[PDB]
Amino acid sequence: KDFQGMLEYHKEDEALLIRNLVTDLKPQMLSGTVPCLPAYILYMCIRHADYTNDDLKVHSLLTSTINGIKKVLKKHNDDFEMTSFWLSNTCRLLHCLKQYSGDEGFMTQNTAKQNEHCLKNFDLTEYRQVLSDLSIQIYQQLIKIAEGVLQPMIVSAMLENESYCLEAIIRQMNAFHTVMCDQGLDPEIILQVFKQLFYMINAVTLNNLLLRKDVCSWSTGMQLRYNISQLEEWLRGRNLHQSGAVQTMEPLIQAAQLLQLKKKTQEDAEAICSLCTSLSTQQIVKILNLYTPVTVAFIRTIQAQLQERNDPQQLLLDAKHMFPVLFPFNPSSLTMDSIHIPACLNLEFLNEV
């Protein structure tokens, strides 16, 4: 019957809709069609509402929605899968609003058939600002989960020799990546996640060797450098080096080197300075004092040069520092004119129109 890309519900069942399509929607439901069918399916409804000029239907549809995404988010703070899921979905529902209600500004990459599918009667920039605000919050939640999973693995998989090993950490990083990719999450958010996680690994580890028993040794310098390089080769293999995540470890790379570099003669001390640029002069001196196989006056010559470059600053780098998110628009090629809505979901009460 020549389906336009649209769907109508009875102004009522809006509840039913939002529950079967959000609340009771488990992602392991594949989809099988679209990792973010929900996002699309919703826009197809926004469209039917724009068609009818039913501003009450739009405002209600995406405020019920946000209530359901927030709801289910809170009943799952803990699970990386759902957050991952509802993060990309949210994000796509936002990409669709930009891609279709948008103006010539976002219509620079649409097929006529796409520029035909756009919203004609509403400007939904207000909800566009709300959904992005939300998906900043979902991302934060996702970092909270991932941090929870990794925190108890960082100091063990690194710094100890041998119940966690760089294998566990690297198995985790795959798990996280796998789910995110399978969820259809944009590749720039995947890149932004692993830059966060790696920064934590740098912060939590370097914190520890500025504290522990007591900073550890030439041995511990060599496991870090190996560990980082295995993390770095992991990045190169999943093609995530351009995420900036290896940069987020230059203090640890320098700490590790600080532990191996020769500490004695002056020529030695000259080195420590020119290499350890990313560490603070009290962090170096600390890692010096804590060493265990360094003398004062080998320390004095050090702190003699690095005079405010730069110290002090709060030691113990708060790994919770959460770098800002950024969701570059990314329109999609798929067209709602052909999109599979399975039956396994009881959305039949939707009319194809």
Residue numbers in the entry: 1464 to 1625, 1651 to 1781, 1789 to 1848
Could you share sentences copied from the article?
Type V myosin (MyoV) motors move protein complexes, organelles, vesicles, and mRNAs along actin cables. The C-terminal globular domain (GD) defines this class of myosins and mediates the majority of cargo interactions. In vertebrate Myo5a, the GD also mediates autoinhibition of ATPase activity in its cargo-free state. In this study, we describe the high-resolution X-ray structures of the GDs from human Myo5a and Myo5b as well as low-resolution SAXS-surface envelopes for all three human MyoV paralogs.
The structure of Myo5b GD was solved at 3.1 Å resolution by molecular replacement using Myo5a GD as template. The asymmetric unit contains one Myo5b molecule (Rwork = 0.25, Rfree = 0.31), which shares with Myo5a the overall conservation of domain organization. An overlay of both structures reveals a root mean square deviation (RMSD) of only 1.1 Å. No electron density was visible for the N-terminal four amino acids, for loop I from amino acids 1625 to 1651 and for loop II (1781 to 1789). Myo5a and Myo5b GDs share 70.5% identical amino acids. A higher degree of deviation was observed for Myo5b. However, these two residues are fully conserved in all three paralogs (red-boxed amino acids) and are in the same position in Myo5a, Myo5b, and Myo5c. This observation suggests that autoinhibition might not be limited to Myo5a.
